[PDB]
């Protein structure tokens, strides 16, 4: 509350100050155009008529010629002319070629594709750590694999043990698995890549395997990293059937990722967060520990856990201090943390029908009936016989 206000005051004088500084600083009159810049500039316009049709450098022959494939089915045996060093260019690089005559005018690309930008989602994690009402014990298993080598390399180095490779998150939805994922992400401040596995299920020829390779390249470039392959099972054990053109694709994608997860050796610097509902009643495709190490089963919320979650929610409510908190959680059997979240939302909705702006003392005892009854129907547990 107050802690948040203190911060607002500082954030609004930082932005203001920066913005004003920036005019001058960027230039607006500074206008570097002295001999070093002028050189670059003059040359660049002359040489480069535009548009410039990109290539891929297939091989070099030492005689300042290269062999490139252009987007046209005819390839072109080109001169290297001007700019980019011969050494700096290594085969497999994507390159700028001049449209009048194809010559290597430089590189600025590095095999830039839109696919990498899409995946790249470092962007502000919605979760900070321990905003969540989850239990200390569950998060301090994910943290142990992922955080702990980055914060304290001293202990791992001294022991001599390798840093762990991967974790698997599985529950039980409504244990806030993806909340957990973005709690971890905030702390590390690592490049947080995300890709969903259904984008790798397509009828399109061979595209799945191409995508799989991209992922390892991306993580390594932007290391240290966490790669969230979310619904890993979409590619794997989970299905899209084979009487739909799937007798080609699904096999090739599953194998491909599998082969790169082992690799010639575990990378040991790319953390993974693998999501899947549970691989207990599903087939396992996440191929043995040492490449996925510690595997994390989140408990179904017990009575003490939901107390902590419940405390967040009751703060905004007024007239729930007279209501005894303890008795609402007990009376309900042990159930999802999602069901306490559902209850809070329903509770407010319900107060409005009574016509009271925020919950009445009565409204809260009533709220429990509607949510418990709905949820037990949705999910029925074996009846004791």
């Amino acid at each position: 509350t107050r802690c948040k206000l203190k911060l607002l005051r500082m954030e609004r004088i930082k932005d203001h100050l920066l913005l004003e500084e920036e005019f001058v600083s960027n230039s607006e009159i500074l206008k570097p155009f002295e001999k070093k810049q002028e050189e670059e500039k003059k040359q660049l316009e002359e040489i480069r008529g535009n548009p410039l049709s990109i290539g891929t450098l297939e091989e070099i022959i030492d005689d300042d010629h290269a062999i490139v494939t252009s987007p046209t089915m005819p390839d072109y045996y080109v001169s290297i002319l001007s700019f980019v060093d011969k050494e700096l260019l290594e085969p497999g690089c994507s390159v700028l070629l001049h449209h009048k005559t194809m010559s290597i005018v430089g590189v600025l690309q590095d095999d830039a594709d839109p696919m990498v930008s899409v995946m790249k989602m470092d962007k502000s994690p919605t979760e900070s750590y321990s905003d969540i009402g989850g239990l200390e014990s569950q998060i301090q298993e994910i943290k142990e694999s992922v955080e702990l080598p980055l914060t304290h390399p001293e202990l791992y180095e001294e022991m001599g043990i390798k840093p762990p490779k991967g974790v698997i998150l599985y529950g039980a939805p409504g244990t806030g698995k993806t909340l957990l994922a973005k709690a971890v992400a905030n702390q590390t401040s690592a490049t947080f890549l995300r890709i969903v596995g259904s984008e790798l299920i397509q009828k399109y020829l061979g595209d799945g395997p191409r995508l799989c390779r991209q992922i390892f390249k991306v993580a390594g470039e932007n290391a240290p990293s966490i790669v969230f392959i979310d619904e890993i099972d979409a590619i794997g054990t989970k299905r899209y059937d084979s009487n739909s053109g799937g007798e080609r694709e699904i096999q090739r994608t599953m194998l491909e990722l599998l082969n790169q997860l082992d690799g010639f050796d575990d990378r040991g610097d790319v953390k993974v967060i693998m999501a899947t509902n549970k691989i207990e009643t599903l087939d396992p495709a996440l191929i043995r520990p040492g490449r996925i190490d510690r595997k994390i089963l989140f408990e179904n919320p017990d009575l003490s856990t939901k107390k902590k979650i419940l405390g967040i929610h009751t703060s905004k409510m007024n007239l729930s201090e007279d209501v005894n908190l303890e008795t609402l959680v007990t009376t309900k059997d042990d159930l999802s943390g999602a069901d306490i979240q559902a209850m809070c939302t329903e509770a407010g909705l319900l107060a409005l029908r009574e016509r009271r702006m925020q919950v009445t003392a009565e409204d809260f005892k009533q709220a429990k009936e509607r949510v418990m009854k709905n949820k037990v129907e949705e999910n029925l547990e074996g009846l004791y016989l």
Partner: protein, 380 residues
């Protein structure tokens, strides 16, 4: 309450404008690679740009008729001739040619095909691993020495017995058996070249493009002497047929077929060993499994108790351990399983000790790590 609501509302606008101001910062300054003295290069470069000898359109001889019949890659055929002077003996079926944009004459013969260059990126040279620190005392480790080393080191004995030299080994085992690990170790020790092919990567298809790559790579090998060609994960693509499906597919039968025929019948080889990595022999087409392709098959056998104490020790050395720690006792409690399972147990024992705030892992830690892994596998 209310006068402090409006403090939030102000905050939000600011943060958004700063982010757009990044574009303005980057500015308009353009500068390209070629520092120190490669911008003085550019001055030479200018006059030669206006000059003409580049590009050359690339085409490929498809027949030499004593002029030449060239076929371009857009698919269009021409009769052409020699340019400055291009010897007849240089131009061969499959040989690329450099021809002019529109005056259509050969300047330089160019080395055949652009497809080796693409696939030579995948190829990795003689990997190195030390055979001594290869876990287990496996029987499998020994039969690899017979296949690979002994024909290369002493081809004489094989001639004398009047057996054929062993050249094919099929590796299969559960994941974490160490198929990749042992192949790298015998590549190193025997001092023979190595060719990495990954069959899972084949996707370039036009009905039989995958078949072109495979013929070229295997042929690359023959040219090479004392070499290994390791086709990795041929479980699918050049592995299983997808004919079985309702609509089905046969781009995989093309790739599969080509490989079978290169192996089957006469065809020279320059001491080419054939290593095949399949997770399961079941997935592998039976055509390949049954003999006259790969000579030998070994079913990997999970490490012995002596071999399992042995892998654990390798790990325990890397670790900081208790003095008098009973490696053998830990191993016995542990299932008969891969070298992998054992790698994991040492990983978690390390971590629980760190959590508990110890720098030396106790015997007790590894009792905990074991209990963890058994349960995992079981529950699934």
């Amino acid at each position: 309450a209310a006068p402090y609501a409006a403090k939030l509302k102000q905050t939000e606008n600011d943060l958004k404008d700063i982010e757009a101001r990044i574009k303005e910062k980057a500015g308009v300054k353009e500068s390209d690679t070629g520092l120190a003295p490669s911008h003085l290069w550019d001055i030479m470069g200018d006059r030669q740009r206006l000059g003409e000898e580049h590009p050359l359109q690339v085409a490929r001889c498809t027949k030499i008729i004593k002029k030449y019949v060239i076929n371009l890659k857009q698919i269009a055929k021409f009769v052409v001739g020699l340019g400055e002077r291009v010897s007849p003996t240089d131009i061969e079926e499959g040989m690329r040619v450099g021809v002019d944009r529109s005056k259509y004459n050969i300047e330089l013969p160019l080395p055949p095909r652009i497809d080796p260059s693409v696939t030579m990126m995948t190829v990795e040279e003689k990997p190195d691993v030390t055979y001594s620190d290869v876990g287990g005392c496996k029987d499998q480790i020994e039969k690899l020495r017979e296949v690979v080393e002994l024909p290369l080191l002493s081809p004489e004995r094989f001639a004398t017995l009047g057996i054929d030299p062993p050249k094919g080994i099929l590796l299969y085992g559960p994941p974490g058996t160490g198929k990749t690990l042992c192949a790298r170790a015998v590549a190193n020790r025997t001092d023979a070249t190595f060719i990495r092919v990954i069959g899972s990567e084949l996707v370039q298809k036009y009905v039989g493009e995958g078949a072109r790559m495979v013929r070229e790579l295997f042929e690359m090998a023959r040219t090479k002497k004392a070499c290994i060609i390791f086709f990795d994960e041929i479980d699918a693509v050049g592995g299983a047929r997808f004919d079985d499906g309702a609509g089905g597919d046969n781009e995989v039968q093309r790739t599969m077929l080509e490989l079978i025929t290169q192996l089957d019948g006469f065809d020279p080889r320059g001491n080419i060993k054939v290593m095949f990595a399949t997770n399961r022999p079941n997935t592998l087409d039976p055509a390949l499994l049954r003999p006259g392709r790969i000579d030998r098959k070994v079913e990997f056998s999970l490490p012995d108790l002596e071999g399992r104490a042995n892998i654990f020790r390798i790990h325990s050395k890397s670790m900081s351990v208790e003095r008098g720690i009973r490696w053998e006792l830990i191993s016995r409690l542990c299932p008969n399983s891969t070298g992998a399972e054992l790698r994991s147990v040492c990983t978690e024992a390390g971590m629980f000790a760190i959590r508990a705030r110890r720098k030396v892992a106790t015997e007790k830690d590894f009792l905990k790590a074991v209990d963890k892994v058994i349960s995992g596998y079981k529950k699934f």
